[PDB]
Amino acid sequence: GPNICTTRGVSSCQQCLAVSPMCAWCSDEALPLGSPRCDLKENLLKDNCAPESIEFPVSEARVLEDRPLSDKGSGDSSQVTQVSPQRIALRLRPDDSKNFSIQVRQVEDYPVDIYYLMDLSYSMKDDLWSIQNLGTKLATQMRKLTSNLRIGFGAFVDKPVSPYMYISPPEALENPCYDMKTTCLPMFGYKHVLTLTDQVTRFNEEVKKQSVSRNRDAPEGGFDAIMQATVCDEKIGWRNDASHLLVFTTDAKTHIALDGRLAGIVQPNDGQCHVGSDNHYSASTTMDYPSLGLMTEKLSQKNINLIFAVTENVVNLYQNYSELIPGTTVGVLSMDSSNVLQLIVDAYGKIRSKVELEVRDLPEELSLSFNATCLNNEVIPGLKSCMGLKIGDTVSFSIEAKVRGCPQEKEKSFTIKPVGFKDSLIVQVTFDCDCACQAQAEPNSHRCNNGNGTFECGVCRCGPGW
Amino acid sequence: LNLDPVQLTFYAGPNGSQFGFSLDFHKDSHGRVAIVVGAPRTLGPSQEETGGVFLCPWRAEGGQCPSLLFDLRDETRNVGSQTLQTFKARQGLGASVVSWSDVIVACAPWQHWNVLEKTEEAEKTPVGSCFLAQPESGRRAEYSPCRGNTLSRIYVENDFSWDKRYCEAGFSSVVTQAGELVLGAPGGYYFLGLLAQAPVADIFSSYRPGILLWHVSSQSLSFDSSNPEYFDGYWGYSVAVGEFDGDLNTTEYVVGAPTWSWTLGAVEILDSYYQRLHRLRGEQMASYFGHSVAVTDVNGDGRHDLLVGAPLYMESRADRKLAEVGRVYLFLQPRGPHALGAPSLLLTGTQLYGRFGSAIAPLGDLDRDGYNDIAVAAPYGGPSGRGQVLVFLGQSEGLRSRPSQVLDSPFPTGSAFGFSLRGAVDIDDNGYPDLIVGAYGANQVAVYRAQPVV
Amino acid sequence: DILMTQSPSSMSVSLGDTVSITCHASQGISSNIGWLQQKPGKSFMGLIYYGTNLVDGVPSRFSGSGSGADYSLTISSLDSEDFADYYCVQYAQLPYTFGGGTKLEIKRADAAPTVSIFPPSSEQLTSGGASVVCFLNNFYPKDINVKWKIDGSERQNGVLNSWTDQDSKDSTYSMSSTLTLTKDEYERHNSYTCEATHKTSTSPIVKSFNRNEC
Amino acid sequence: EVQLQQSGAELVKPGASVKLSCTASGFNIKDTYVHWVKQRPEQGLEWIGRIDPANGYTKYDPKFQGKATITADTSSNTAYLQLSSLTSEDTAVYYCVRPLYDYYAMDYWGQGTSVTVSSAKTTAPSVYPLAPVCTGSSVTLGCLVKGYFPEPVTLTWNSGSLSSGVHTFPAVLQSDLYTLSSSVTVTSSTWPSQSITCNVAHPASSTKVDKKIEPR
Ligand SMILES: *[C@@H]1O[C@H](CO)[C@@H](O[C@@H]2O[C@H](CO)[C@@H](O[C@@H]3O[C@H](CO[C@H]4O[C@H](CO)[C@@H](O)[C@H](O)[C@@H]4O)[C@@H](O)[C@H](O[C@H]4O[C@H](CO)[C@@H](O)[C@H](O)[C@@H]4O)[C@@H]3O)[C@H](O)[C@H]2NC(C)=O)[C@H](O)[C@H]1NC(C)=O
Ligand SMILES: N=C(N)c1ccc(C(=O)N[C@@H](Cc2ccc([N+](=O)[O-])cc2)C(=O)N2CCc3nn(CC(=O)O)cc3C2)cc1
Ligand SMILES: *[C@@H]1O[C@H](CO)[C@@H](O[C@@H]2O[C@H](CO)[C@@H](O)[C@H](O)[C@H]2NC(C)=O)[C@H](O)[C@H]1NC(C)=O
Ligand SMILES: *[C@@H]1O[C@H](CO)[C@@H](O)[C@H](O)[C@H]1NC(C)=O
Ligand SMILES: [Ca+2]
Ligand SMILES: [Ca+2]
Ligand SMILES: [Ca+2]
Ligand SMILES: [Ca+2]
Ligand SMILES: [Mn+2]
Ligand SMILES: [Mn+2]
Ligand SMILES: [Mn+2]
Structure with a gap:
């Protein structure tokens, strides 16, 4: 019986495929005049159409790279496979859809970088004392989770400029604590101290030589330090294949963008590295504090997991900042940083407990749908993320792509990647809208109105200019 | 809508002077409109940045401007067994300028001050100071209400109560039609922020050079607090005046506190005695709600309306992501004694990091349709990030949600085109209010003339 | 303390005359000086502050000058109400110190008792x-x-x-x-x-x- | 208008104490500094001390450390000066001073509070007529008021009738008691042709004695 392929009354093989993914075309010469050429493939073979002349593309999905997931992240020159498959070939005809899957695993024994960024204003003096052994203490507990650990250290105070900085008497510039009965360091914005190294005793012996400074206003310039520790890849030393933890410890509020105007500073933050050979942030007194949006861009660009380790008096403050900066973790720090060790371990477990898919370079005509198989084989429709995971667990996502019409460019490629992961899945799409018989067309055919048309796929088409 | 973007007028200052950081229209005793421009990084006598003020006569060609001279020398007075010191290096004279009658008030928010008594001191801190000038007569006067003579030890004993040492008075400024100068000091009371008010005529009559510390009995400052919601709130970052209480004899104050309540930001409307009438709370933290405030009646009901800028607002976009664009809020004053409700209209920026809402200028009635209009700046907006100024026309229900005209920066990148704005003055005397736009990054000011509607 | 030597102790002058009272200090006080008037049997009125600034309400015929440790009070064209006492006072250092005092008396022809x-x-x-x-x-x-x-x-x-x-x-x-x-x-x-x-x-x-x- | 209103004149005994007041009129006492100045005919003007009524902090000339104690109450808008262990050298006029514009100036002054320290009791005067000796065209009479306390005394001639041609000299303290004299001049044909009487009143002791001048 008649269907949508015949009742549409198409004019060519290309238009026949555009009607429905079920329509096929017969390019055979020996075909009755009344018998239509655009019908189901079953009906075409039923009407003695040559099987070679039948044009009927089928949407498929085959894998090109299918590395098995890694059991261990240790060893290798980062030959770890966190996503499977890594590349598939996708073929779609107009208005059709095809489905494919992707597996994501939080690999066990994955290398970890931890850069300890520490408020060193005067109220953190007792915090310095209780972390002198933190380097070796942290190595023992992280040894249970990873075999490739690297740790570093940096410190901040505030912008060394009035009114944040005491500028009288001249003695107060070399020693801000002059009016008390103690000595503290001259004021500094942010200074790098120790590049990410696996020699944990370098952390202890650097911390034992640090000391606090003193500024006037409770909000501090830690966001200046978060920016530099993020965009100075080579100086801090983030490894390409490792989880990047930035531990931000403070007990006070933080300065934000446009606060710098109270120090005559109006130039916006450029998001570039400005820490030179002296390991000090040189644009501290000429460039304003960064904004939350600019911090988020650089944190996501460098795959940095920011951790707000703040005291209870400002937890709600930084818990709210963390909601405006996705991927950020908050932990309650003691008044002397005595619990920062367990705070770091808890944050690291909280960081690798989630898998969230992200799409890049998806064409306009395509639309995706996702399913989550978290926990024990429990399907969750319309979801592209899982939570509550542990190290070594594996989740899977069933994906379907639906194309709208037929685009101009017949070959494109997009990417599926979990948030923070190194590996990804590359989907090479090919839009099969045309017919193979079009490649052997006859322009100026003498079968078609005395050379006024083109004979392709067993029919006559109006040539160029008509 | 009817501003001319083809034939502009350009004024310019020295290189690196940040000429155009602040601007205002100035009418002399005859009504001839000029343009006062602040350049907070102008070199002084010691080849050091002290700031400067320029008084530009109106010329369709523009060009260079003469200087409005002020005393840039540091002052020292040994009196009452004490030593009073003023420090004008990097004071930023011209970081804010404002004109009232035939008087110009230019302020140096970062002018420092210190009092030495034997081995003790009051700590060298930025109290700020404003310079006042009557150009035609040559009269000069200063106003620095946050200067004190209390030594550092006393502030520690009182837990830093009533500490005005870091006021930075003149950070923002405005003058009531009665002639009362109102200065915003966002560092007063240990960065809570305060407001300082004093009649202009009394500042002149009470001032004598060299005194440094003198009483202005008719002045009136705001009050300290113990409320942690005001801590580091920068009360007075932006200031404005209007009529919000129904009484036409009283003048109300509008104050911006962009970090109020742990960087939530707020704007408060007060009477002349600093008693709060309303408080507008911010919508998003660190958005700097209250960076700029503007007062004008946009819907033509005779009641002043309020506009608040939040240049760092992050708009919600697809896939649970945020994009910093900035946002402007419009509040319409309700009929009679009632509280300002929710915003009547939200205007959101489009360019990432554009800082839409960094400055809001009332234009008056631009197209002469009966409703006053406004201009909003995005100093790093536009498709090129060079900066944009957008015009929104008033209507019976408030403001149009879409701009009637967009001004692209004629300056190179980084000029901060739009960082300062000022309108509602007909400078060429053609019956249409015009717009002056500052761009301190390029040390220039562009004048847009309004033309009959096409 | 700072000694304030005012001179003269008294002077006999007529109306319309232009007279000058001087005040010398034991050290430099840099214009931190004030002048006072005490009409017969009445209280004190402030004339000058910071060396040269007239107190509000004082006529323009009064005028102060000087610097360092030497200052003066000059009255151009004396009025009948100007015949009174006049004191200088420094406030550069604590304690404040005053001058000896100058009395303006009416001049007339000599007369035997x-x-x-x-x-x-x-x-x-x-x-x-x-x-x-x-x-x-x-x-x-x-x-x-x-x-x-x-x-x-x-x-x-x-x-x-x-x-x-x-x-x-x-x-x-x-x-x-x-x-x-x-x-x-x-x-x-x-x-x-x-x-x-x-x-x-x-x-x-x-x-x-x-x-x-x- | 700025007006400083001080307490009335005080009459006290040595070794006792007195507390002067200085009330602010037309302004708030808390605005500026408030100084205290002492005045004596010989010693001239002396600076006692100052106070900032906004906080109570004070400064003193070391010469007065002990006797003088400056305080202030912003409630009554008043500043006080207390003097203890009084002596005859403390007898002086005391003014409270505040500046106009300059923080450290001395521009506005109160009317001044008189203080008299003495152990003398309320004593009535002894009036004596002064008649000339046993010639010219002008005659001169007199009247001696001796040994009264405290001040003042009013003296007239013929109950205020004869007012011109008179010289009433200031009183002089003579061993804890005051002494005053007055002279009057008329023509020869007036006296003893017309009666001339010396009218004296001492309201402290409530006495109004009159002595008629009689020739010798
Ligand atoms: C970090 O971010 C959180 C989340 O926004 C902030 O917590 C909010 O704080 C504001 C102000 O402190 C709260 O606003 C107030 O809400 C009250 C109603 O809340 C009820 O419902 C919530 C829903 O979960 C319950 O949690 C809560 O216990 C209540 O049952 C109102 O009563 C308040 O109205 C009163 O005050 C306002 C001015 O604040 C007046 O205008 C009103 O007329 C009235 O007098 C007010 O609306 C908000 O509820 C809080 N949310 C939560 C979830 O706690 C933190 O403050 C913030 N911290 C920092 C440091 O920034
Ligand atoms: N109601 C008002 N108007 C009002 C509101 C707030 C304040 C105020 O904020 N006061 C400071 C006092 C103060 C000064 C110096 C020091 N110090 O040097 O140790 C420690 C504390 C304050 O409490 N701070 C919080 C903690 C702190 N630690 N630090 C040292 C560093 O971080 O360098 C600096 C701070 C700032 C005042 C008044
Ligand atoms: C994700 O799972 C949902 C079910 O929770 C799928 O939705 C159904 O898919 C079947 C496929 O044969 C259809 O027959 C049903 O009609 C669908 N249910 C509806 C539309 O309510 C969905 O297809 C899955 N997607 C992927 C990509 O696996
Ligand atoms: C598409 O879905 C079906 C049923 O859900 C499944 O059997 C098939 O494996 C999926 N396609 C691919 C390529 O995995
Ligand atoms: Ca009003
Ligand atoms: Ca209105
Ligand atoms: Ca209009
Ligand atoms: Ca015009
Ligand atoms: Mn601190
Ligand atoms: Mn601590
Ligand atoms: Mn700080």
Whole structure:
């Protein structure tokens, strides 16, 4: 019986495929005049159409790279496979859809970088004392989770400029604590101290030589330090294949963008590295504090997991900042940083407990749908993320792509990647809208109105200019 | 809508002077409109940045401007067994300028001050100071209400109560039609922020050079607090005046506190005695709600309306992501004694990091349709990030949600085109209010003339 | 402390004159000085502050000047109300210190005094006392020296003097000298004299009486 | 208008104490500094001390450390000066001073509070007539007011009738008791042709004695 392929009354093989993914075309010469050429493939073979002349593309999905997931992240020159498959070939005809899957695993024994960024204003003096052994203490507990650990250290105070900085008497510039009965360091914005190294005793012996400074206003310039520790890849030393933890410890509020105007500073933050050979942030007194949006861009660009380790008096403050900066973790720090060790371990477990898919370079005509198989084989429709995971667990996502019409460019490629992961899945799409018989067309055919048309796929088409 | 973007007028200052950081229209005793421009990084006598003020006569060609001279020398007075010191290096004279009658008030928010008594001191801190000038007569006067003579030890004993040492008075400024100068000091009371008010005529009559510390009995400052919601709130970052209480004899104050309540930001409307009438709370933290405030009646009901800028607002976009664009809020004053409700209209920026809402200028009635209009700046907006100024026309229900005209920066990148704005003055005397736009990054000011509607 | 040496102690001048009062300090005070006025029998009025600034309400004929440790107060064209006292005061250092004071007096032609001596009253002598009064009324200038003589010999113990301010009418001065003795000591002698020394006469003006004799 | 209104004149005994007041009129006492100044005819003007009524902090000339104690109450808008262990040298006029514009100036002054320290009791005067000796065209009479306390005394001639041609000299302290004299001049044909009487009143002791001048 008649269907949508015949009742549409198409004019060519290309238009026949555009009607429905079920329509096929017969390019055979020996075909009755009344018998239509655009019908189901079953009906075409039923009407003695040559099987070679039948044009009927089928949407498929085959894998090109299918590395098995890694059991261990240790060893290798980062030959770890966190996503499977890594590349598939996708073929779609107009208005059709095809489905494919992707597996994501939080690999066990994955290398970890931890850069300890520490408020060193005067109220953190007792915090310095209780972390002198933190380097070796942290190595023992992280040894249970990873075999490739690297740790570093940096410190901040505030912008060394009035009114944040005491500028009288001249003695107060070399020693801000002059009016008390103690000595503290001259004021500094942010200074790098120790590049990410696996020699944990370098952390202890650097911390034992640090000391606090003193500024006037409770909000501090830690966001200046978060920016530099993020965009100075080579100086801090983030490894390409490792989880990047930035531990931000403070007990006070933080300065934000446009606060710098109270120090005559109006130039916006450029998001570039400005820490030179002296390991000090040189644009501290000429460039304003960064904004939350600019911090988020650089944190996501460098795959940095920011951790707000703040005291209870400002937890709600930084818990709210963390909601405006996705991927950020908050932990309650003691008044002397005595619990920062367990705070770091808890944050690291909280960081690798989630898998969230992200799409890049998806064409306009395509639309995706996702399913989550978290926990024990429990399907969750319309979801592209899982939570509550542990190290070594594996989740899977069933994906379907639906194309709208037929685009101009017949070959494109997009990417599926979990948030923070190194590996990804590359989907090479090919839009099969045309017919193979079009490649052997006859322009100026003498079968078609005395050379006024083109004979392709067993029919006559109006040539160029008509 | 009817501003001319083809034939502009350009004024310019020295290189690196940040000429155009602040601007205002100035009418002399005859009504001839000029343009006062602040350049907070102008070199002084010691080849050091002290700031400067320029008084530009109106010329369709523009060009260079003469200087409005002020005393840039540091002052020292040994009196009452004490030593009073003023420090004008990097004071930023011209970081804010404002004109009232035939008087110009230019302020140096970062002018420092210190009092030495034997081995003790009051700590060298930025109290700020404003310079006042009557150009035609040559009269000069200063106003620095946050200067004190209390030594550092006393502030520690009182837990830093009533500490005005870091006021930075003149950070923002405005003058009531009665002639009362109102200065915003966002560092007063240990960065809570305060407001300082004093009649202009009394500042002149009470001032004598060299005194440094003198009483202005008719002045009136705001009050300290113990409320942690005001801590580091920068009360007075932006200031404005209007009529919000129904009484036409009283003048109300509008104050911006962009970090109020742990960087939530707020704007408060007060009477002349600093008693709060309303408080507008911010919508998003660190958005700097209250960076700029503007007062004008946009819907033509005779009641002043309020506009608040939040240049760092992050708009919600697809896939649970945020994009910093900035946002402007419009509040319409309700009929009679009632509280300002929710915003009547939200205007959101489009360019990432554009800082839409960094400055809001009332234009008056631009197209002469009966409703006053406004201009909003995005100093790093536009498709090129060079900066944009957008015009929104008033209507019976408030403001149009879409701009009637967009001004692209004629300056190179980084000029901060739009960082300062000022309108509602007909400078060429053609019956249409015009717009002056500052761009301190390029040390220039562009004048847009309004033309009959096409 | 800072010594304030004001000069002159007094001056005789006329209306419309232009006069200058000076004030020297023991050290430099850099214009941290004020001038004061005290009209006869009344309180203080502020004239100048910080060396040159007029107090609100003060006429423009007053004018201050000086620097370092030397300053001046100048009155152009004196008015009748300007005849009063004037003090300088420094406030550069604590404690504040004042000057000695300058008195402006009306100038007029010299005038010899009118002397009159008075023996003790009958009422006083009956009570046990004895006072010999000697008035010296209406004279100019103010400088004058009285001298009591008992039996031709000077007496200095028991003299009580009193001077009036410059008279509002004739701008002269007057003086009252009173010698008080006991009734017994008064009758040991006879002659009683009060001599007056003035620049109007090289010879002293003398008036005297004799006890019992009349 | 700025007006400083001080307490009335005080009459006290040595070794006792007195507390002067200085009430602010037309302004708030808390605005500026408030100084205290002492005035004596010989010693001139002396600076006692100052106070900031906003906080109570004070400064003193070391010469007065002990006797003088400056305080202030912003409630009554008043500043006080207390003097203890009084002596005859404390007898002086005391002014409270505040500046106009300059923080450290001395521009506005109160009317001044008189203080008299003495152990003398309320004593009535002894009026004596002064008649000339046993000639010219002008005659001069007198009147001796001796041994009264405290001040003042009013003296007239013929009950205020004869007012012109008179010189009433200032009182003089004579061993804890004051002494005053007055002279009057007329023509020869007036006296003893017309009666001339010396009218004296001492309201402290409530006495109004009159002595007619009689020739010798
Ligand atoms: C970090 O971010 C959180 C989340 O926004 C902030 O917590 C909010 O704080 C504001 C102000 O402190 C709260 O606003 C107030 O809400 C009250 C109603 O809340 C009820 O419902 C919530 C829903 O979960 C319950 O949690 C809560 O217990 C209540 O049952 C109102 O009563 C308040 O109205 C009163 O105050 C306002 C001015 O604040 C007046 O205008 C009103 O007329 C009235 O007098 C007010 O609306 C908000 O509820 C809080 N949310 C939560 C979830 O706690 C933190 O403050 C913030 N911290 C920092 C440091 O920035
Ligand atoms: N109601 C008002 N108007 C009002 C509101 C707030 C304040 C105020 O904020 N006061 C400071 C006092 C103060 C000063 C110096 C020091 N210090 O040097 O140790 C420690 C504390 C304050 O409490 N701070 C919080 C903690 C702190 N630690 N630090 C040292 C560093 O971080 O360098 C600096 C701070 C700032 C005042 C008044
Ligand atoms: C994700 O799972 C949902 C079910 O929770 C799928 O939705 C159904 O898919 C079947 C496929 O044969 C259809 O027959 C049903 O009609 C769908 N249910 C509806 C539309 O309500 C969905 O297809 C899955 N997607 C992927 C990509 O696996
Ligand atoms: C598409 O879905 C079906 C049923 O859900 C499944 O059997 C098939 O494996 C999926 N396609 C691919 C390529 O995995
Ligand atoms: Ca009003
Ligand atoms: Ca309105
Ligand atoms: Ca309009
Ligand atoms: Ca115009
Ligand atoms: Mn701190
Ligand atoms: Mn601590
Ligand atoms: Mn700080």
